[PDB]
């Protein structure tokens with residue numbers, strides 16, 4: 001590429017998500033739901049580099065698989081889709097997705113090497129167009145959650161490491177989208193202006209890297225792209241869906257030198273309204289379905305693609321109240337319970353997403 005990194009490529013559906021579905025879901029399902037689950041195992045969702053171990057195992061593995069498929073003559077050729085998700089003091093406003101590294105224990109250096117090695121593999125696989133979402137939740141937390149001790153303490157590290165990632169992974173075959181929360185997070189009129197300055201400043205301090213295409217929204221969340229009727233839980237936010245958020249956000253970013261395109265996560269937003277009782281409820285939300293299949297055909301000037309970033313069926317957090325990573329949000333009445341550790345397969349949730357899929 002070129003313009004839109006989603007143009008002229010197919011998105012790779014990774015083997016690890018398909019294996020989960022076949023190994024852990026299908027055996028427990030009816031014949032009809034096993035069929036539907038087989039179709040979903042083939043829908044491309046982003047592969048998360050959530051642990052350092054993934055870099056020289058699952059990440060390099062997937063890159064090799066993609067090269068093999070393209071060498072065999074894939075047409076359009078396959079592009080890889082990955083999430084960089086291992087900041088030290090990760091998930092700073094919550095408990096459920098705390099990561100392996102901490103700032104206190106050499107986390108920043110650990111992250112720099114993690115990034116360095118990712119860069120090496122991208123160089124090694126420069127033949128594979130690679131699309132990255134950078135660090136879901138991180139910068140959105142910087143906008144709204146500076147009152148939270150873990151966030152404010154991590155703030156300077158987050159900003160240094162984000163710039164570092166954007167500079168290091170800035171390669172011609174790569175497109176990056178910085179995570180930018182969602183309409184119910186950064187779309188609030190009181191949050192949208194500080195968000196615009198923070199993103200524009202990170203972008204400029206990173207030297208306006210060519211590989212930075214724009215922002216991802218709705219990652220691991222559930223908002224409508226475009227809905228006529230604002231869900232009750234969205235009131236009084238005028239930016240009640242991702243379309244409203246992105247259209248309000250883009251000119252503010254543009255005014256500060258960051259002319260962003262967007263991708264929107266549609267993997268868990270097929271059923272509207274969702275089962276959320278309040279908008280801020282993010283964990284394993286009840287009454288959700290698989291949404292619009294990933295496509296570059298968005299019909300909207302600012303959106304490069306609808307994508308599945310959060311892999312449906314992988315938990316957002318454990319509901320085990322005695323667990324170290326227990327977060328009360330995962331124990332609420334609109335959260336599906338019992339639920340396993342974040343990232344772990346969550347059969348009952350997977351089932352819900354299948355049943356509620358929309359389109360079917």
Ligand SMILES: OC[C@H]1O[C@@H](O[C@H]2[C@H](O)[C@@H](O)[C@H](O[C@H]3[C@H](O)[C@@H](O)[C@H](O[C@H]4[C@H](O)[C@@H](O)[C@H](O)O[C@@H]4CO)O[C@@H]3CO)O[C@@H]2CO)[C@H](O)[C@@H](O)[C@@H]1O
Pocket residue numbers: 091093094096097137144145182184185186188189190191219220221279280281282
């Ligand atoms: O998305 C997955 C991710 O979620 C993280 O939790 C996020 C929620 O996703 C998000 O909905 C929530 O958004 C808040 C926002 O931060 C507040 O600024 C805003 O405050 C409103 C308030 O509700 C109104 O009463 C008031 O009048 O207006 C203000 C705005 O000025 O409320 C919204 C909705 O509740 O923020 C959460 C983070 O704190 C998780 O932490 C993460 O683990 C998940 O992966």
Ligand SMILES: *[C@@H]1O[C@H](CO)[C@@H](O[C@@H]2O[C@H](CO)[C@@H](O)[C@H](O)[C@H]2NC(C)=O)[C@H](O)[C@H]1NC(C)=O
Pocket residue numbers: 052053055056110113114117
């Ligand atoms: C993160 O993972 C990398 C591998 O991707 C680790 O780097 C390797 O460390 C081992 C030592 O156990 C060596 O055998 C390798 O040669 C190292 N480098 C590479 C590029 O493979 C690294 O140690 C991990 N980081 C942390 C903080 O544990």
Ligand SMILES: OC[C@H]1O[C@@H](O[C@H]2[C@H](O)[C@@H](O)[C@H](O)O[C@@H]2CO)[C@H](O)[C@@H](O)[C@@H]1O
Pocket residue numbers: 016047048050051096097220310311314315316317342343344
């Ligand atoms: O434990 C590794 C497991 O994690 C998955 O990534 C998770 C991440 O762990 C979690 O904190 C966040 O909320 O969601 C992502 C995506 O579900 C990863 O996708 C799996 O491959 C992996 O087995």
Ligand SMILES: [Li+]
Pocket residue numbers: 096097220316
């Ligand atoms: Li999360």
